[PDB]
Amino acid sequence: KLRIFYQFLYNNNTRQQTEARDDLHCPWCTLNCRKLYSLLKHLKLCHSRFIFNYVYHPKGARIDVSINECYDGSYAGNPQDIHRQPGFAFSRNGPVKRTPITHILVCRPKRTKASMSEFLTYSSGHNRLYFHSDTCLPLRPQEMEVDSEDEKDPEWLREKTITQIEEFSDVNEGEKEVMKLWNLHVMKHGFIADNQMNHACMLFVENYGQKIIKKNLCRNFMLHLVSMHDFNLISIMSIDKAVTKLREMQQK
Amino acid sequence: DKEAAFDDAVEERVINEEYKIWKKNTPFLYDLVMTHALEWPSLTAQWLPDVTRPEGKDFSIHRLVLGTHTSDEQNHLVIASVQLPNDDAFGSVSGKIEIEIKINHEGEVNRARYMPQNPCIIATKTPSSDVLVFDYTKHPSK
Amino acid sequence: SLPRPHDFFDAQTLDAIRHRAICFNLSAHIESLGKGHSVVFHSTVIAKRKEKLLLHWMPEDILPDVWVNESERHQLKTKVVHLSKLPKDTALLLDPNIYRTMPQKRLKR
Amino acid sequence: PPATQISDLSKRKPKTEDFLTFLCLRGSPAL
């Protein structure tokens, strides 16, 4: 005997109450599960796309069946192939580099006795596909160990600083040029320390000395040095050294 | 044939579903089931005889001689350490299949049969006509 | 709730599987006559051995032809055989995706 | 009595010419 009843449920509003023609048999797999515990566990494990909430019946067993809402059944291979263009996804033609990952599924199960009361993971490494912050495109492992893609002075910030400086009305052209050059240098090096500012000035003539000489804004540069000395930081010795280095660039 | 490509795609989907089903039943089929995704595919695998059993630790350390199969990069002769749950009870011990040594290898490694009389010497089959017998002891770890 | 994991089968694979299943049900009668776990093959007399009779079943290249007497032919004009008992050499022909070597390709060993 | 699970699945996966008719061709939808 052992009449088994299946009650398929969708949104709890539409139901289809059935009865297994072959008792103690998997309706999908056509497998002979001789014990109701074995049948329920096989349904729960092999046919994981459904959920089986055993509810018991006065005559036999009533198994309510519903579609597994979550059922994480995504691609289990290399996450890159989930976004490769058609014709190259799941190519399997050659070796593909992937970020290492370690999984432990079964370690030491308890192996308890069978019981109907039952019917009332660890991963190490990168376990997903990463995307670029800028372009929102998938990130290949070859571009992972380097290129953090977040640096001190973004190009938009530099362009905005240049535009803001050049957008002033009460400023000379060469003075605007030297101000923009100093701002770009500071952003490129990210000085935050007053003492470093001294060395900063030298670095300026080590990177913008030729540009200033070609632009012929040396007088404006030394005016900027004087203003900086007035704002503290740098020094008379620093001003002299920077100017002499600038003069040596012209003689070179 | 386009039909062959369509069958290949359907087969890939079915393989994914079958792997998901098998992983659902992994606890009921195996005692220990540890899956690690190497950076490069390995064409060879052979446990080294040496096993380390640290006192007071619930695991043991074994050495695996894995090869490398790089599409265009530098191929290697990986030697990795694997932690096994021993007899009773690991839950979380951080890295478990981390590598130990890596020797530069010209071309992908086809075999990694270690010398049995002295596991220091490990042989490898290069894609060329010459066979290389490495020695991970003499070579730098990095 | 937790994000939807974007099931891998999608609809193209599901449509192909539906077409293959409809073809299988129309050919081998697995669902109806096979009780959901068998392939029903319809034999047809081809040659008569006057010393039995040779019969070939409806699914071609699945089961080899056999020699049977006239009464045996009448009794077993239709043979129902479980998939587990199918010859492994030719059982794959029942469906292209029953087992396909996914990396056909070349090179390798 | 209320249909059968295997026949119900056979009334689900194929819904075309090769549906074997039978009770599937009958008022299977909407009970």
Binding site: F8 | V14 | S84 | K13
Partner: peptide, 27 residues
Amino acid sequence: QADHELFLQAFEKPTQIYRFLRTRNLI
């Protein structure tokens, strides 16, 4: 009703997948 058709399709997708798997696994 359309709800019945939606339920039938939502159960037909996994039912078809598992029926193909049942056919394939026995071989």
